[PDB]
Amino acid sequence: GPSQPTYPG
Amino acid sequence: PVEDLIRFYNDLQQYLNVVTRHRY
């Protein structure tokens, strides 16, 4: 499950 | 947000601090 796939921008 | 930048950088370090710290 996608836990917290935060990403840059 | 600097926090997001730091988190994304910290991941690269964690992979070397949780793996090599138990294999090196």
UniProtKB/Swiss-Prot annotation, chain A:
Q: Which domain of life is it from?
A: Eukaryota
Q: Where in the cell is it found?
A: Secreted
User: What does this protein do, in the record's words?
Assistant: Hormone secreted by pancreatic cells that acts as a regulator of pancreatic and gastrointestinal functions.
Give the record's family classification: Belongs to the NPY family.
Its name, as the record gives it, is Pancreatic polypeptide
What is the organism field in this record? Meleagris gallopavo (Wild turkey)
UniProt gene name: PPY
